[PDB]
Design a protein around this ligand. Structure first.
Ligand SMILES: COc1c(N2C[C@@H]3CCCN[C@@H]3C2)c(F)cc2c(=O)c(C(=O)O)cn(C3CC3)c12
Ligand SMILES: COc1c(N2C[C@@H]3CCCN[C@@H]3C2)c(F)cc2c(=O)c(C(=O)O)cn(C3CC3)c12
Ligand SMILES: [Mg+2]
Ligand SMILES: [Mg+2]
Ligand SMILES: [Mg+2]
Ligand SMILES: [Mg+2]
Lengths: 689, 689
DNA sequence: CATGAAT
DNA sequence: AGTCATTCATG
DNA sequence: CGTGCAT
DNA sequence: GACTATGCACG
């Protein structure tokens, strides 16, 4: 796995720890083989502060590093009998690169302290533009090619920028204070989450060879990584309930006109467009997210319609993106409704070539309807799906009554509504969840006892808990029968066809079916505990939220959308109305206008003449001057006046929405009810206490 | 890997052999678990009538097919011990599916004869269309009163209802009518003898429940696969020298404006667009093809420029399409020159939503310049790269002298010009190759001797034979030292860097350096034999062609392109002249026309009046009537008469090309010389005899 | 045993 | 993101 | 131990 | 085209 140097020399030999096999290859190509060695770090280096000391020793990356370095580890470590003068960590210039640097540094600190204390650990700093490393260097170089990673850099460019000892700009790792360094590393990388959460809260603001400390290097790297994972990866926006990857998937597919009323496009075509325009990451990661939105046992209201093998409840792999074809679902269209009307904040992509929405208009409150999950850094998320009609009903009520209480809201939104059905138990815990954000509810399979011939009964499962694998469940129940942990099971039988779920647990003659069913509920996943952990992104910061701040954030959002949409349509109507006013007046003086253009020197002089001599505005003067010749035939002013009437009425009703809070909220309620009527579906999960 | 039936029954159990894992997964969901078992066949099945029996027994696909059939194989085959009553083969509707059916049928023939003789071996026929479903184009025509490209685009419920439901499926019963003729049919198609197969293809293939015989099924299936892979996969077109996948890559990237003058584009975005619009195959195959066109040690003139790790001469894996950026090279633009002018026959793609070029205009003879290779069915190709300037000079001569002899052409085209360089020996065999298509020439590494200290010498290799892996060569050379197959080798060192190839073979003190160098040339790969096998596609058929059928077919192609282009520009200039002629008349009667349009009631009326009153044509009247108002200012009649003159001359020069074979041929030469001057590059390979 | 578009 | 196996012609 | 976006 | 290991919070 390691590319070694030509000659052995522990006085000049350098070890390059490269992030990735591709970048490892590029390094291997652009290196100096006389003394430079390459070691690909395939994946993320294990946490040698969290993981056990056994599984740490059973790690491939760690072992081949301890072998390539050739000095041992822990207390059996002799820096004198090493193999390298310098060990350089070369990663991508992005956030995940900063995470690898963090993980690798904690390794070389916890188990190879003398190597770091002797200043033998370095950090290669690849350029960010093309050469510039900062924004100030770009400014000075302006008097560009943004490197998305090491993969986009050539071998000769790699050497000239970051590998040549005379040209490279390294960051030397030094231990200034062993006490403050021990504290920092142990907090950021410890098993305890709470000190890490607090550190992120207090520090991270969400708004040729230099030497850096350990505390500074661990702070700038884990600080850069934490902020990006919370804001721009794992956690959903509190409004549209989407992670950046899902929003980019829905938007790109919509921009490519890949909607529900059109033909399916090949998945790879969509995935490729997402990656080249908005989401600068792996094709597999994007596709796996695209597939999940097509699975109706993961989402209560699917956003993608996919043809072919997209998986099952048995958890078998979906067809590769070379096979499947996809398109947005009809209800996914409402998430993107009026996006063409400046109703949402847009920001530049990584490419700085095209703008992308930071949030979707969300004509329906997706965050509650579909849910989210949900593993960040310092924070985590688990929001269950809900009924489309019920959430809307609660939303409509809160629109009328902003200061509504949870007890009243639960008359409309009684609890979660899993797409997999099953039984939810714990009315008290549901309330606790809708208030504080956290809460532990019990999810139970829908069962039915069928009596067989011979005095023997049979348990028949028809629905299973959310996020539970059907195939793994059957195996676990069968293991109970095989091991005879409990007595009475004759045969476990998955009888689920393409049109129904059915797990049949046939029991022996004279066997307490109550004793068995109770055992399977406790020791298998027939019954599970579902933990609420409703955390989302409100105002760029992570926020644990109940049912109230969620609904309030959605209402506040839809208000902005409706207001912005109204300004947009009013802007269009005004501009035409202004043009129609001019055209009507033109007909009254058609002869003198044509005579004026006839006397004009050019297009610009013609418009300037229309302004001065006949008080037409710039916008009007443009429309008049660019009229096709045949429009001189028409002198019917009546039809244009009918358009004036229609436009003036539209501007009026639009302005009232912008000017009257009540009128606006009435509109919002009207649309939320239409969405309800169109996409209403009965409950699947029963509620008990 | 096998999904067994829930109930073992050698009377009703079916065994579906599915092409691919994903399709096997879809079948695993759409099956009836009571009696339908699934066995996914991953990749093409081994040719059991072509490979050594030792390799056959080691083939895991065969072993897992026998051990699940439960009846052994060969002479030790009890037909009553089988666990399945029916064995259905379910492949895609495409030609590769027909190949698998062929390979499988020969196995069940050779090693399981009683199984096929009992009529238990079936062939499942998937639907081809979906509007209900239809298997034939006639059935689609009747159903008219979704084109499936495989099984990966079908849902589980769809696959069941159409091909898996035993009461609603179309099956093919494989019956062996005669054991005599079926043997010759099997051996000719699958046997180790290539010549009889090539003859059978040239004799049968026209290049332009329900029972079925074995000889008929084998001929129909393999016939389709033979034809398809011959003219639509492995072999290049004789005109633009491109395989279908290479042509689709170039056209797609050019259509997406991913060219040399513009920014680089993420590779996955290009691959996805190709796969979804033109080339209905795997992403890796398309990307690998795209990567090769970027490697400057395989192509004499790269057609794709690529940023990042695109591999090396050591054979190390290039970066995945997630990492790399790419765009068309400048010279690749000349392959697509004038494609927007209907100079090339187009054809519908697989979606019938977009038309693709069947051949590129090719402003330079790409077949000889870049070469091709080169493994089809019944045929194979191997054309070496040539110098761009030399091939053009050869073609230019043949334009003036159609009946040019080979000995004369070689004064301009002396031989191949490998991008890897090295030495070519064998003037005689080159001529034999340029005449017949086949030839065996010798390629020798470029070496030099460097005197060292202590009286030692050092062999230095700077250039190596075409298509030779540098990493393996060094290993094989060093293996000579290790095994001491020749005396005097001290150390083998690859000293190549990012700007120079260098393999230093350091010798010992008193060692015969001439002896060492001679042994390596003969027993390693410092010297190899390049075998010409110039086979291309001429008139939809594979043709073993010499240097003359190639150059002539290119000139013939360039003729059609230039003729079709000249007609395009002429019709364009004609219609434009027609308008200019009318606009000049209008100026002299501007007021009368404006008054005439004002007097008119509408657009249609205005044109009829422009016709009747001033004899303007319909095309002329339309142009006048649709002029924007400001055009009444730009009333310069002279600059219109300049365009009029400029157009009449352009038509005159274009008509001369269409109406004179010589003037057209001079245009070929003029343009070919321009291409030559722009992309001229010195030889890299030296020639000897 | 490689080569290169396919599975 | 690398690894793993087969087709096909051919020396 | 599985979860779902990342390496 | 499936297989294999890491992060991160959490019962
Ligand atoms: C499972 O088939 C493949 C294999 N194998 C064949 C053997 C089967 C049993 C034991 N494992 C190996 C793995 C392989 F080595 C490579 C590829 C491959 O590169 C590829 C592609 O699209 O680029 C596609 N496929 C699938 C489309 C056939 C490959
Ligand atoms: C080599 O890393 C990966 C592994 N491995 C990690 C271990 C390292 C030593 C060898 N064995 C395993 C293989 C893996 F199991 C899965 C994926 C993976 O799914 C994936 C993706 O984009 O979808 C990307 N990568 C690469 C981007 C890191 C994966
Ligand atoms: Mg990266
Ligand atoms: Mg993955
Ligand atoms: Mg196929
Ligand atoms: Mg492959």
């Amino acid at each position: 796995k390691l590319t070694p140097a030509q000659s052995k020399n522990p006085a000049k030999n350098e070890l390059y720890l490269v992030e990735g096999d591709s970048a490892g290859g590029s390094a291997k190509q652009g290196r100096d083989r006389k003394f430079q060695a390459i070691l690909p770090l395939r994946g993320k280096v294990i946490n040698t502060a969290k993981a056990k000391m056994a599984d740490i020793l059973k790690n491939e990356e760690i072992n081949t590093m301890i072998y390539t370095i050739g000095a041992g580890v822990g207390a059996d470590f002799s820096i004198e009998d090493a193999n390298y003068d310098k060990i350089i960590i070369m990663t991508d210039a992005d956030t995940d690169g900063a995470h690898i640097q963090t993980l690798l540094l904690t390794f070389f600190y916890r188990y190879m302290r003398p190597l770091v204390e002797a200043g033998h650990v370095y950090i290669a700093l690849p350029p960010l533009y093309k050469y510039a490393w900062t924004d100030g260097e770009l400014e000075e170089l302006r008097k560009l090619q943004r490197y998305k990673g090491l993969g986009e850099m050539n071998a000769d460019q790699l050497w000239e920028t970051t590998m040549n000892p005379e040209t490279r700009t390294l960051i030397r790792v030094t231990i200034e204070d062993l006490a403050r360094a021990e504290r920092r590393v142990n907090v950021l990388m410890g098993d305890k989450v709470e000190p890490r959460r607090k550190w992120i809260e207090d520090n991270v603001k969400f708004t040729n060879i230099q030497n850096m400390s350990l505390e500074d290097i661990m702070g700038e790297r884990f600080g850069r990584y934490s902020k990006y994972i919370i804001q721009d990866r794992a956690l959903p926006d509190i409004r549209d309930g989407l992670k950046p990857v899902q929003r980019r998937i829905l938007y790109s597919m919509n921009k490519d006109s890949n909607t529900f009323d059109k033909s399916y496009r090949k998945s790879a075509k969509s995935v490729g467009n997402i990656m080249g325009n908005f989401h600068p990451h792996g094709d597999s990661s994007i596709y796996d997210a695209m597939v999940r939105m097509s699975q109706n046992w993961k989402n209560r209201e699917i956003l993608v319609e996919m043809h072919g093998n997209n998986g099952s409840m048995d958890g078998d792999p979906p067809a590769a993106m070379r096979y499947t074809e996809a398109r947005l679902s009809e209800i996914a269209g409402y998430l993107l409704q009026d996006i063409e009307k400046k109703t949402v904040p847009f920001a530049w992509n990584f490419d700085d070539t095209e703008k992308e929405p930071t949030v979707l208009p969300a004509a329906f409150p997706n965050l509650l309807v579909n849910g989210s999950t949900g593993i960040s850094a310092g924070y985590a998320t688990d929001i269950p799906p809900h009924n489309l009609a019920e959430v809307i009903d609660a939303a409509v009520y809160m629109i009328d009554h902003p200061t509504a209480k949870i007890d009243k809201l639960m008359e409309f939104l009684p609890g979660p509504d899993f797409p997999t059905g099953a039984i939810i138990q714990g009315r008290d815990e549901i309330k606790k969840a809708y208030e504080t954000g956290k809460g532990r509810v019990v999810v139970r399979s829908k069962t039915e006892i069928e009596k067989l011939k011979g005095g023997k009964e049979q348990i028949v499962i028809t629905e299973i808990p959310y996020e539970i694998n059907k195939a793994n469940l059957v195996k676990k129940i069968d293991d109970v029968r095989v091991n005879n942990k409990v007595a009475g099971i004759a045969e476990v039988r998955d009888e689920s066809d393409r049109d129904g779920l059915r797990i049949a647990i046939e029991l022996k003659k004279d066997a307490n079916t109550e004793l068995v069913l109770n055992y399977l509920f406790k020791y298998t996943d027939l019954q599970i505990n579902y933990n609420f952990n409703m955390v989302a992104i409100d105002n760029f910061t992570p926020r644990q939220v109940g049912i109230v701040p969620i609904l309030s954030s959605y209402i506040a959002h839809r208000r902005e959308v409706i207001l912005a949409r109204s300004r947009f349509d009013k802007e269009k109507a005004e501009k035409r109305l202004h043009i129609v006013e001019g055209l009507i007046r033109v007909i009254s003086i058609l002869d003198e206008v044509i005579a004026l253009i006839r006397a004009s020197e050019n297009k610009a002089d013609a418009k300037e003449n229309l302004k001065v001599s006949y008080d037409f505005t710039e916008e009007q003067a443009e429309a008049i001057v660019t009229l096709q010749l045949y429009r001189l035939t028409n002198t019917d002013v009546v039809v244009l006046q009918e358009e004036e009437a229609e436009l003036r009425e539209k501007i009026a009703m639009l302005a009232a929405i912008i000017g009257d809070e009540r009128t606006m909220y009435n509109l919002m309620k009207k649309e939320l009810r239409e969405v309800k009527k169109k996409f209403a579906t009965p409950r699947l999960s029963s509620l008990e206490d």
